């Protein structure tokens, strides 16, 4: 059995996660809409998605290079 | 070569998709934070996630039952 406080906690957890998952689905739908718009303008959607992935990978690489920089500087001092 | 209007279109597409993908990542992080909070309260996160999936499946089932209802009613009229 779950006591009163725990039942409240559970209900709050489910409520918040479900609201966030609705927002996430809304965002995903908007991304789909932007790509559909692009397709309408004559763009290649598969290639656009690849452009986005490549740029994401570049940003990730730069962040890890910042981490590595802090590691080296730390080690040197 | 891409003409002026097409270059503007491309830049707008990438800009909007990347902003939306940042929002999506923010939402995913918030979901993680809610589950971390739940774990702190003594809840089983794996089981919570399963609760959320089950409820999502129930909602999906109800939507498809509404679709099927419209199909049957349509066919009958």
Numbering used by the authors:
A (entry chain A), B (entry chain A): 11 to 87
Show sentences the authors wrote.
GapR (growth-associated A/T-binding protein involved in regulation) is a chromosome structure protein conserved in α-proteobacteria, and it is discovered initially as an essential nucleoid-associated protein for normal growth and cell division in Caulobacter crescentus (1–3). Depletion of GapR gene in Caulobacter cells results in severe defects in cell growth, cell division, cell size, DNA replication, chromosome segregation/condensation and gene expression. Our current studies clearly demonstrate that free GapR is a tetramer, but not a dimer. Taken all together, there exist both major conformation and minor conformation for free GapR in solution, which are in dynamic exchange equilibrium with each other.
Interestingly, during our crystallization of GapR/10A sample, we also got a crystal which produced a dimeric structure of the Caulobacter GapR protein only, without the detection of any diffraction from DNA. A comparison of this GapR dimer structure with that of the dimer-unit from the open tetramer complex revealed that the backbone heavy atom RMSD for residues 16–65 is 0.32 Å, while residues 66–89 show larger deviations for both protomers. SAXS analysis results indicated that the experimental Rg value of the free Caulobacter GapR in solution is 28.6 Å, much larger than the calculated Rg (22.8 Å) based on this GapR dimer structure. Comparison of the calculated scattering curves from the GapR dimer structure and the experimental SAXS data of the free GapR shows a fitting χ2 value of 21.9, indicating the solution structure of free GapR can not be like this dimer structure. Analysis of the GapR dimer structure, it is apparent that the hydrophobic areas (residues 78–87) on the second α-helices are fully exposed, while the same hydrophobic areas in the closed tetramer participate in the formation of the tetrameric interface. It is possible that the dimer structure can not stably exist alone due to hydrophobic aggregation, when the C-terminal hydrophobic areas are fully exposed due to the disruption of the tetrameric interfaces for GapRΔC3, GapRD68A and GapRY82A mutants. }{}$$\begin{equation*}\ R{{\rm g}_{{\rm app}}} = \sqrt {\left( {{C_{\rm A}}Rg_{\rm A}^2 + {C_{\rm B}}Rg_{\rm B}^2} \right)/\left( {{C_{\rm A}} + {C_{\rm B}}} \right)} \end{equation*}$$\end{document} where CA and CB are the mass concentration of the major and minor conformers with radii of gyration of RgA and RgB, respectively. If the minor conformer is a dimer, then its radius gyration RgB (22.8 Å) is even smaller than RgA (26.9 Å) of the major conformer (closed tetramer), which can only result in a Rgapp that is smaller than RgA based on the above equation. Taken together, the possibility can be ruled out for the closed tetramer to dissociate into dimer in free GapR.
